[PDB]
Amino acid sequence: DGQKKHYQDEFAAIPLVPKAGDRDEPDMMPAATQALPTQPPEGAAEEVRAGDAAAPSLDPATIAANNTEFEPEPAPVAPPKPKPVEPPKPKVEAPPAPKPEPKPVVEEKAAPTGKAYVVQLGALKNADKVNEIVGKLRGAGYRVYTSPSTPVQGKITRILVGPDASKDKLKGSLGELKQLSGLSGVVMGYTPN
């Protein structure tokens, strides 16, 4: 019981450096009733006891914003001004003659079913047209699937190339996927059902 613990409540990483480190409680688990006479107020709660609020005021969602999709404050990536993202000058959709295996993708990556990805080339309510788009790609043996519930005539059927749960594997592949499918596909995050 001190007026100054040290700086915040320490419990993690206390190699016998503080007097006790672990806060000696007056009544709850370490003894009962009078376990801690308590001459200075110590902490009690005050307002911010320990894990109170603990919420970034600037960042609404650090795990969603920030470097997740490049969010710079000093130099914001505003649309105007022509800026490339390292164009395929040395090689433009060059098909690897040998198949490279930089660590088998038998891991999660992004997350299984969580942060999956898919490339939407089309979306139409005419299944006749659906059969073409899928017939072009899936018929050629590419990983091609359609909108969540069911392709049907009259309802919107989206056509998506490259269903995969590995964003790293697949979402980095979109550049060469324009060779793989060659259809006009937009980057969409896949959430299986």
Tab-separated table of C-alpha atoms in Angstrom:
chain	number	residue	atom	x	y	z
A	1	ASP	CA	0.000	0.000	0.000
A	2	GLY	CA	1.787	3.059	-1.287
A	3	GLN	CA	0.865	6.492	-2.585
A	4	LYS	CA	3.212	5.675	-5.443
A	5	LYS	CA	3.189	2.115	-6.768
A	6	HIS	CA	5.916	3.121	-9.230
A	7	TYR	CA	4.210	3.782	-12.556
A	8	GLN	CA	1.013	1.863	-13.374
A	9	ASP	CA	0.280	-1.542	-11.855
A	10	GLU	CA	3.079	-3.972	-12.607
A	11	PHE	CA	2.780	-7.741	-12.657
A	12	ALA	CA	4.381	-8.737	-15.930
A	13	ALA	CA	8.190	-8.679	-16.037
A	14	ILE	CA	9.054	-8.311	-12.357
A	15	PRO	CA	12.369	-10.199	-11.870
A	16	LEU	CA	12.337	-9.465	-8.136
A	17	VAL	CA	13.029	-5.837	-9.006
A	18	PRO	CA	10.119	-4.113	-7.142
A	19	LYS	CA	9.418	-4.782	-3.455
A	20	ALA	CA	6.569	-7.125	-4.334
A	21	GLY	CA	5.475	-6.126	-7.819
A	22	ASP	CA	2.173	-7.959	-7.572
A	23	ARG	CA	-0.320	-5.629	-5.892
A	24	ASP	CA	-1.084	-6.869	-2.389
A	25	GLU	CA	-4.878	-6.842	-2.167
A	26	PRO	CA	-6.821	-6.017	1.051
A	27	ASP	CA	-9.676	-8.495	0.552
A	28	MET	CA	-10.656	-10.716	-2.394
A	29	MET	CA	-8.207	-13.616	-2.680
A	30	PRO	CA	-4.979	-12.864	-0.703
A	31	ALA	CA	-6.376	-13.204	2.830
A	32	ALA	CA	-9.660	-11.631	3.920
A	33	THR	CA	-11.062	-8.600	5.752
A	34	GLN	CA	-7.765	-7.106	6.946
A	35	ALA	CA	-5.086	-8.309	4.566
A	36	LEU	CA	-3.926	-4.786	3.850
A	37	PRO	CA	-4.246	-2.034	6.513
A	38	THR	CA	-3.809	0.499	3.699
A	39	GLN	CA	-2.380	3.769	5.001
A	40	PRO	CA	-1.954	5.466	1.567
A	41	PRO	CA	-4.875	5.134	-0.913
A	42	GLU	CA	-2.703	3.029	-3.243
A	43	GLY	CA	-5.148	2.936	-6.134
A	44	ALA	CA	-8.558	1.412	-5.404
A	45	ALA	CA	-9.942	2.550	-8.756
A	46	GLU	CA	-10.072	6.360	-8.916
A	47	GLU	CA	-11.207	6.440	-12.530
A	48	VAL	CA	-8.816	4.451	-14.680
A	49	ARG	CA	-8.284	1.434	-12.453
A	50	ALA	CA	-6.374	-0.732	-14.917
A	51	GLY	CA	-8.151	-2.034	-17.997
A	52	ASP	CA	-10.615	0.822	-18.157
A	53	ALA	CA	-11.611	1.953	-21.654
A	54	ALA	CA	-8.141	1.317	-23.125
A	55	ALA	CA	-9.283	2.583	-26.507
A	56	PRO	CA	-7.227	4.541	-29.094
A	57	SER	CA	-8.738	7.991	-29.563
A	58	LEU	CA	-7.220	8.673	-32.977
A	59	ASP	CA	-7.438	5.199	-34.497
A	60	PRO	CA	-11.063	3.945	-34.686
A	61	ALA	CA	-9.768	0.481	-35.536
A	62	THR	CA	-6.014	-0.074	-35.638
A	63	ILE	CA	-6.431	-3.645	-36.913
A	64	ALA	CA	-8.571	-2.386	-39.802
A	65	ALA	CA	-7.003	0.980	-40.573
A	66	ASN	CA	-3.332	2.008	-40.442
A	67	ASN	CA	-0.791	0.000	-42.465
A	68	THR	CA	-3.491	-2.572	-43.171
A	69	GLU	CA	-4.138	-0.775	-46.459
A	70	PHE	CA	-1.525	1.991	-46.260
A	71	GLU	CA	-2.911	4.847	-44.171
A	72	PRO	CA	-0.285	7.639	-44.002
A	73	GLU	CA	-0.965	10.839	-42.041
A	74	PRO	CA	1.957	13.098	-43.220
A	75	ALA	CA	1.755	12.080	-46.876
A	76	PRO	CA	-1.767	10.700	-47.547
A	77	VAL	CA	-2.140	8.575	-50.674
A	78	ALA	CA	-4.664	10.867	-52.341
A	79	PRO	CA	-5.969	9.847	-55.822
A	80	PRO	CA	-4.489	12.855	-57.808
A	81	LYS	CA	-0.912	12.839	-59.155
A	82	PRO	CA	0.205	9.922	-61.373
A	83	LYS	CA	1.945	7.332	-59.224
A	84	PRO	CA	2.743	3.725	-60.187
A	85	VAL	CA	3.047	0.785	-57.816
A	86	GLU	CA	6.196	-0.556	-59.471
A	87	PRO	CA	4.956	-1.436	-62.995
A	88	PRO	CA	5.746	-4.829	-64.617
A	89	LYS	CA	8.598	-3.407	-66.690
A	90	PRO	CA	11.166	-6.267	-66.149
A	91	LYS	CA	8.413	-8.834	-66.663
A	92	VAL	CA	4.698	-8.452	-67.323
A	93	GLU	CA	2.722	-11.552	-66.342
A	94	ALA	CA	5.648	-13.854	-67.041
A	95	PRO	CA	4.499	-17.471	-66.521
A	96	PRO	CA	7.012	-19.328	-64.310
A	97	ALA	CA	8.336	-22.252	-66.338
A	98	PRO	CA	9.435	-23.972	-63.085
A	99	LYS	CA	6.848	-24.025	-60.299
A	100	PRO	CA	8.321	-22.251	-57.254
A	101	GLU	CA	7.416	-23.454	-53.777
A	102	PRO	CA	8.495	-20.733	-51.285
A	103	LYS	CA	7.299	-22.705	-48.248
A	104	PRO	CA	4.165	-24.855	-48.801
A	105	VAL	CA	1.024	-22.832	-48.118
A	106	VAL	CA	-0.271	-25.418	-45.679
A	107	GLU	CA	-0.539	-22.650	-43.122
A	108	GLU	CA	-3.475	-20.364	-42.389
A	109	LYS	CA	-2.453	-16.937	-43.729
A	110	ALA	CA	-4.904	-14.119	-43.250
A	111	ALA	CA	-7.266	-16.682	-41.738
A	112	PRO	CA	-9.126	-19.879	-42.762
A	113	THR	CA	-12.597	-18.776	-43.902
A	114	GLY	CA	-11.968	-15.548	-41.995
A	115	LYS	CA	-9.988	-13.245	-44.259
A	116	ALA	CA	-10.413	-15.182	-47.491
A	117	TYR	CA	-10.287	-13.515	-50.896
A	118	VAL	CA	-11.880	-13.828	-54.345
A	119	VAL	CA	-11.666	-11.947	-57.659
A	120	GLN	CA	-15.032	-10.896	-59.116
A	121	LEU	CA	-14.921	-10.666	-62.931
A	122	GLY	CA	-18.626	-10.395	-63.557
A	123	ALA	CA	-22.076	-10.094	-62.020
A	124	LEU	CA	-25.286	-10.557	-63.973
A	125	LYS	CA	-28.790	-11.853	-63.495
A	126	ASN	CA	-28.685	-13.884	-66.685
A	127	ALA	CA	-27.515	-17.431	-65.999
A	128	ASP	CA	-27.001	-17.904	-69.727
A	129	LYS	CA	-24.223	-15.364	-69.440
A	130	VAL	CA	-23.058	-16.891	-66.162
A	131	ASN	CA	-22.540	-20.200	-67.945
A	132	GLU	CA	-20.236	-18.446	-70.431
A	133	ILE	CA	-17.995	-16.636	-67.985
A	134	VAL	CA	-17.657	-19.749	-65.840
A	135	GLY	CA	-17.453	-21.918	-68.940
A	136	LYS	CA	-14.527	-19.841	-70.170
A	137	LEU	CA	-12.569	-20.062	-66.927
A	138	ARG	CA	-13.835	-23.042	-64.955
A	139	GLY	CA	-14.114	-24.945	-68.177
A	140	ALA	CA	-10.421	-24.299	-68.735
A	141	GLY	CA	-9.749	-25.740	-65.305
A	142	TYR	CA	-9.371	-22.565	-63.273
A	143	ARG	CA	-10.626	-22.081	-59.729
A	144	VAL	CA	-13.870	-20.304	-60.515
A	145	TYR	CA	-16.970	-20.012	-58.428
A	146	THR	CA	-20.068	-17.910	-58.278
A	147	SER	CA	-22.127	-15.776	-55.911
A	148	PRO	CA	-22.761	-17.174	-52.388
A	149	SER	CA	-26.183	-18.813	-52.507
A	150	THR	CA	-26.946	-19.830	-56.114
A	151	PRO	CA	-26.621	-18.716	-59.757
A	152	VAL	CA	-30.095	-18.552	-61.209
A	153	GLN	CA	-31.864	-16.763	-64.036
A	154	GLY	CA	-33.357	-13.509	-62.803
A	155	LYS	CA	-31.123	-13.168	-59.748
A	156	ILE	CA	-27.683	-11.600	-59.534
A	157	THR	CA	-24.924	-14.115	-60.164
A	158	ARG	CA	-21.420	-12.873	-59.494
A	159	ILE	CA	-18.480	-14.646	-61.111
A	160	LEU	CA	-15.345	-14.942	-59.025
A	161	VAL	CA	-11.926	-16.307	-59.879
A	162	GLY	CA	-9.479	-17.592	-57.359
A	163	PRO	CA	-11.526	-18.505	-54.279
A	164	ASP	CA	-9.018	-19.024	-51.528
A	165	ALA	CA	-8.702	-18.448	-47.813
A	166	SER	CA	-5.064	-17.423	-48.111
A	167	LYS	CA	-4.869	-13.727	-48.825
A	168	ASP	CA	-1.074	-13.842	-48.982
A	169	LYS	CA	-1.039	-16.625	-51.551
A	170	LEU	CA	-3.970	-15.480	-53.657
A	171	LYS	CA	-4.150	-11.697	-53.196
A	172	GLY	CA	-0.531	-11.259	-54.161
A	173	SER	CA	-1.341	-13.379	-57.178
A	174	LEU	CA	-3.905	-10.972	-58.651
A	175	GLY	CA	-1.245	-9.301	-60.754
A	176	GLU	CA	-0.446	-12.540	-62.553
A	177	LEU	CA	-4.061	-13.667	-62.239
A	178	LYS	CA	-4.822	-11.137	-64.984
A	179	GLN	CA	-2.883	-13.669	-67.032
A	180	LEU	CA	-4.573	-16.624	-65.342
A	181	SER	CA	-8.114	-15.445	-65.958
A	182	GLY	CA	-7.540	-12.311	-67.981
A	183	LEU	CA	-11.083	-11.240	-67.183
A	184	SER	CA	-11.933	-7.946	-65.545
A	185	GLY	CA	-11.918	-8.888	-61.898
A	186	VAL	CA	-12.022	-6.726	-58.802
A	187	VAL	CA	-10.378	-7.567	-55.498
A	188	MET	CA	-13.011	-8.732	-53.009
A	189	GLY	CA	-12.647	-10.346	-49.630
A	190	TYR	CA	-14.126	-13.823	-49.539
A	191	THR	CA	-16.295	-14.960	-46.658
A	192	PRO	CA	-17.412	-18.585	-47.243
A	193	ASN	CA	-20.850	-19.844	-46.268
